Amino acid sequence: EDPPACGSIVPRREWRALASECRERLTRPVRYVVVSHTAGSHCDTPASCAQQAQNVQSYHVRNLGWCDVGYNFLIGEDGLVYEGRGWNIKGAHAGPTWNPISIGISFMGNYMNRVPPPRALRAAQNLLACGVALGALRSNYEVKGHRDVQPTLSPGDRLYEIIQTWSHYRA
Amino acid sequence: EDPPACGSIVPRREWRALASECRERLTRPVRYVVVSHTAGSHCDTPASCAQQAQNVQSYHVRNLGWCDVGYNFLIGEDGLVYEGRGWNIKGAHAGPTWNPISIGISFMGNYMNRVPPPRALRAAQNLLACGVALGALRSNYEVKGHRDVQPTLSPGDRLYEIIQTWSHYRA
Amino acid sequence: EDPPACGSIVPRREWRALASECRERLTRPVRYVVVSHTAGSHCDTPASCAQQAQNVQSYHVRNLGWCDVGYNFLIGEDGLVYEGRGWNIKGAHAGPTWNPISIGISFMGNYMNRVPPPRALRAAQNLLACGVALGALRSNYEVKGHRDVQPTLSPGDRLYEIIQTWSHYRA
Amino acid sequence: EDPPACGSIVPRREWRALASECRERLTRPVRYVVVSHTAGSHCDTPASCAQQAQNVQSYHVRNLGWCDVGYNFLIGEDGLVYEGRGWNIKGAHAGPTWNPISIGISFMGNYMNRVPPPRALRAAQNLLACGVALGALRSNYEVKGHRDVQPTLSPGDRLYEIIQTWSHYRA
Ligand SMILES: C=C(O[C@@H]1C=C(C(=O)O)C=C[C@H]1O)C(=O)O
């Protein structure tokens, strides 16, 4: 109903991110969301996840020489949403075709032979509600698996099976 | 103007490929090579690897709608090399920066918890030798891992391990 | 199959186009759109534009002996789409590597030191958007300028700058 | 600021329109489309048709003192759609039992002893189909004539006889 109607998000400074150097912005409302999964180690405390997230960022910044973490948003299993590039800055997470037309959310961990916990899934679906509410996402936005637009296993077999159930998934 | 044939490569027709609708060209000599696994399941026979390559091309063109299979070449556990987009046409295998300036060779299978059979390395290594003999690749080309230039587990742990020991590999 | 009510194209009859003798089809769906200009007189009224089109088809039929107007569509500074060969038949607009696999659309003028009006850019953009919707185009279709695929100044220098900015523009 | 497409509409500021001051919104998805004719002067080029859309707003804003041009959309004989109040703002074009339940499109001119060229009829048709895509118009839209609902002669005898021959027309 009300303007800032949403989202319990761990901001950058909180998980101690490096400064985002990125500039290329997105066009709202965004139509597409791509679900990814870091495929690496997985956390479950505000404390271990805030670490997790920061590793990840570091990797994409230092090793691959990028301007900030690939994703716009990372879901922890602590149940929290770790802020990535956010709703307005174009991601680097799913090919040159989808990055300027999608929001990229990554479950932190590896879900080929596991599921993220109930609450991880809530954080994210809620985050998407939040995104629509703020006009970042088109009301009828579609959700694609990462393997749906990239050669990849991401977002893992189990998690994929789950997002394929969602109201907004459009194969 | 020496003719050093070194193409023990299974041609597209032999592994029975759909047609590349890909048209954009890499300028030769190409300076970098990026090694990726498919992270699919392995094939150990020309007859299965024929099918395997059929499918990898299929996942790229059908589900992803790509001009044609992402890689310039595919290595098999059958010890044979498969014609991807070959030496001249730009791949789609490492994203907008490396794509135009690298050959993306890809091992067919998943190497978090395997190593590719010695014959698969031999095929791979020699392929490059071949690549240099023609002028496709620079005498002094540098080899990256897939994870080195894009967030992914590709080319797999045990294989990543191995290609780091390789001569032409670069930090 | 699913048919919308897409576009506002001026059918051949209306701009008084001759009968086409053209008979060769393209494969659905076309991956490429190639943007050009006519480098001739610029029309800006629906009337003078209808002429311009007819003028162009003419020079293509009675002078180059082609089966039709060269372009699949034409585009008025009047802000209207002119039906040429259409979505299904082959254009004669960009060399024989490119004609069999593309859609040529051609702005009606000389855009070396001029911009097309905003209304013409919308026509084009919207006309494309349609193709996709009709399934005449791939959704991930790729736009190139004439000069990308032939040695020319088409689609004019100023229009060329403009098209580079486009979502689906691949260099 | 957008991939600029749907029904190739001329935007407000493009015809030099004084900013709306209107606030009442429509309840999407809207049921009715009331086709009127301005009853004023007819134009037939984009230049003359901007000057005409502008002239109507003037009479609505300066003289009658409405927050904006009455109709949601105007259709030029230049065969281009002029956006007045658009898809969301309630129109002032079909009275107070109809204004909150319909999109008011109007044809610039007097269609008693003439009809609008197909080029506008097409633009109009497309506008509605573009409406549905947006979800601003409900796919089973029903199209009434200005006289069907308000004692008046709009949209002219000759135009009115055409309207009834439309598919989604209900009498
Ligand atoms: C594809 C078109 O453009 C439209 C523009 C849209 C937008 O801007 O969000 C949404 C849907 C499309 O229907 C078209 O009408 O041809």
UniProtKB/Swiss-Prot annotation, chains A, B, C, D:
Which residues does the UniProt record annotate as the domain N-acetylmuramoyl-L-alanine amidase?
28-156
Q: Which GO terms describe its cellular component?
A: extracellular region
Q: Where is this chain's protein located in or outside the cell?
A: Secreted; Cytoplasmic granule
Disulfide bonding pattern of the chain: 6-130, 22-67, 43-49
Superkingdom of this entry's organism? Answer: Eukaryota
Assembly and interaction partners: Homotetramer.
What this chain does, per the record? Innate immunity protein that plays several important functions in antimicrobial and antitumor defense systems. Acts as a pattern receptor that binds to murein peptidoglycans (PGN) of Gram-positive bacteria and thus provides bactericidal activity. Forms an equimolar complex with heat shock protein HSPA1A and induces programmed cell death through apoptosis and necroptosis in tumor cell lines by activating the TNFR1 receptor on the target cell membrane. In addition, acts in complex with the Ca(2+)-binding protein S100A4 as a chemoattractant able to induce lymphocyte movement.
Q: What is this protein called?
A: Peptidoglycan recognition protein 1
Query: Which Gene Ontology molecular function entries are recorded, alphabetically?
Result: N-acetylmuramoyl-L-alanine amidase activity; peptidoglycan binding; peptidoglycan immune receptor activity; zinc ion binding
Instruction: List the keywords (alphabetical).
Output: Antibiotic, Antimicrobial, Disulfide bond, Immunity, Innate immunity, Secreted, Signal
The gene is: PGLYRP1
- The answer to keyword Disulfide bond applying to this record is yes
What is any one GO biological process for this UniProt entry? defense response to Gram-positive bacterium
- Which family is it part of? Belongs to the N-acetylmuramoyl-L-alanine amidase 2 family.
Which InterPro entries does the protein's record reference? Amidase/PGRP_sf, Amidase_domain, Peptidoglycan_recognition, PGRP, PGRP_domain_met/bac
Query: Any keyword Protein transport?
Result: no
Question: Cross-referenced PANTHER family, in alphabetical order?
Answer: PEPTIDOGLYCAN RECOGNITION PROTEIN (PTHR11022), PEPTIDOGLYCAN RECOGNITION PROTEIN 1 (PTHR11022:SF58)
